[PDB]
């Protein structure tokens, strides 16, 4: 709601920023975004198959889309990405390797190189959910001895890690450019 | 898109209506929302799990949700329900059945009692996607002895078929009540 807001609020200026949100289907990325409650998640098909889920605030735009299903016209979206977030179903233990395939193909692309990356090990709230320590060792998080990270648990149902994961997120950008 | 606007004109009174447009997911549902090019596609999630598409033009709102897979809150929706379009992924001969089974299901609702039933036989371009007399079958429209009904095969992508579902379902619904 406003809490989150007031977070963004110090990020605002004459300037687009982005905010990439990407995970595999059902991770939890809907959720977040009708959780922070910032304005309306309005849905735009740039290319058939290729659903692109959009919340503006202000000067700062939260873009949405599943991974694993690259593609070209994704570039024209990383030329304004201030961060990433990477959201993984903790509790999905099948498909964690590849949440680390696309996690890796995404930090490999050039203009992505300066961007602060926020993992979000939502799900948090299933019986046999890994804990962000699980997630941060097979996404091998640990070996990003480059970039400027972070890995939050959360459960985006209840609500709870969204803000202390976006508090870290939106200090990295105050102080990123 | 404003070939589809003028299409619902006539029924521009200031009566609240909504047509509501189901199926399996994968069918086609946001595809065809986003084709029409009405106005923008807000998601919503009224209660955990439960994500809902809306394209509002005026007195009209086109809410979209993937079935398959009856609660307390469609019974609400069903309550100012005229259209019912039911979108079909014409390829996937497996979930027919169950796309049938759900359909049949929505029809037993009362308030869904006087709803105009139109069926979209989509992905229809693709080499296997069954036609609209072998769907008829599948889902067995013809034992629908006691309601408006209309099959439109079509493709969504490209648009074919679009306007002859839908122009059908105007009539319908210009002498409803
Ligand atoms: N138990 C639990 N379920 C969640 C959580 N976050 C999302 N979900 C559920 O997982 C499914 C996928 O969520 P969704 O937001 O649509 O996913 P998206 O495909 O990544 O955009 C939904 O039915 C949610 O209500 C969470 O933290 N815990
Ligand atoms: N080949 C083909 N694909 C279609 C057609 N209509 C939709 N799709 C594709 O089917 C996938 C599912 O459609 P979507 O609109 O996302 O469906 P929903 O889950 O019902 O909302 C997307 O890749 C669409 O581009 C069609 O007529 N032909
Ligand atoms: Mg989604
Ligand atoms: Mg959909």
């Given at each position: 709601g406003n809490i989150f807001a007031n977070l963004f609020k110090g990020l605002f200026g004459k300037k687009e920023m982005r905010i990439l949100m990407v995970g595999?289907?059902?991770?939890?990325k809907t959720t977040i975004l009708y959780k922070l409650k910032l304005g309306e998640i309005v849905t735009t098909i740039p290319t058939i198959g290729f659903n692109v889920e959009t919340v503006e605030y202000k000067n700062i735009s939260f873009t949405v889309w599943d991974v694993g299903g690259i593609r070209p016209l994704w570039r024209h979206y990383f030329q304004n990405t201030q961060g990433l977030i990477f959201v993984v179903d903790?509790?999905?233990?099948?498909?964690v390797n590849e949440a680390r395939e696309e996690l890796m193909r995404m930090l490999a692309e050039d203009e992505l190189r300066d961007a602060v990356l926020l993992v979000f090990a939502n799900?948090?709230?299933?019986?046999?959910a890994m804990n962000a320590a699980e997630i941060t060792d097979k996404l091998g998080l640990?070996?990003?001895?480059?970039r400027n990270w972070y890995i939050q648990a959360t459960c985006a149902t209840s609500g709870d890690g969204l803000y202390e994961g976006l508090d870290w997120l939106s200090n990295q950008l105050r102080n990123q450019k």
């Open positions: 595999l289907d059902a991770a939890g903790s509790n999905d233990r099948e498909r799900k948090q709230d299933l019986p046999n640990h070996s990003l001895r480059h």
